[PDB]
Design a protein around this ligand. Structure first.
Ligand code: HEM
Ligand SMILES: [Xe]
Ligand SMILES: [Xe]
Ligand SMILES: [Xe]
Ligand SMILES: [Xe]
Length: 145
């Protein structure tokens, strides 16, 4: 039942992944501005959250995130088939200054974006399913630490 909730809710999001991931990252930086400095291109720091929105490379980073979530949605019944990628993804993260405790804020910004996108269709069952999927994803990436 849960996998079908995940695939049905994702369907709307995946049609316009940059618009939706823009919402996730805007929210992430409103909640935790101290993450902003981790996204550096040409050795420069964004001053404000809206600076990140004007950067091709940052907008490219978002498309890559939404592609990886999409991979997790396509493989929701068996993530074992994705676990090796995520563990390496995790490693890339720990190496670039990312803290494990930052994962909860990222998950809440994902849930926020899904809830804002889905509206009445974001039933507690959908919230719970996504929170379980995100938790499995974070488990795998935590190995890389
Ligand atoms: C724990 C909170 C997280 C923080 C603070 C964080 C931060 C970062 C940073 C700073 C980068 C490097 C960006 C660049 O140089 O272009 C990155 C890359 C990336 N992140 Fe996250 N991240 C988090 C969690 C996640 C999660 C849960 C996912 C979903 C699986 C994800 C997906 C990705 C992908 C696909 C890349 C690109 C990896 C590559 O280019 O090889 N991140 N992340
Ligand atoms: Xe943003
Ligand atoms: Xe990717
Ligand atoms: Xe995410
Ligand atoms: Xe996820």
């Amino acid at each position: 039942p849960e996998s079908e909730l995940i695939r049905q809710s994702w369907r709307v999001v995946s049609r316009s992944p940059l618009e939706h991931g823009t919402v996730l990252f805007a929210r992430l930086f409103a909640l935790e501005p101290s993450l902003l400095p981790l996204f550096q291109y040409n050795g420069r720091q964004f001053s404000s959250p809206e600076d990140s929105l004007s950067s091709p490379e940052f907008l490219d980073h978002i498309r890559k995130v939404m592609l990886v979530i999409d991979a997790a949605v396509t493989n929701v019944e068996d993530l074992s088939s994705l676990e090796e990628y995520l563990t390496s993804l995790g490693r890339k993260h720990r190496a670039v200054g990312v803290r494990l405790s930052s994962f909860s804020t990222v998950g809440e910004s994902l849930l926020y974006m899904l809830e804002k996108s889905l509206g009445p269709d974001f039933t507690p069952a959908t919230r719970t399913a996504w929170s379980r999927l995100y938790g499995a994803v974070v488990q795998a990436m935590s190995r890389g630490w």
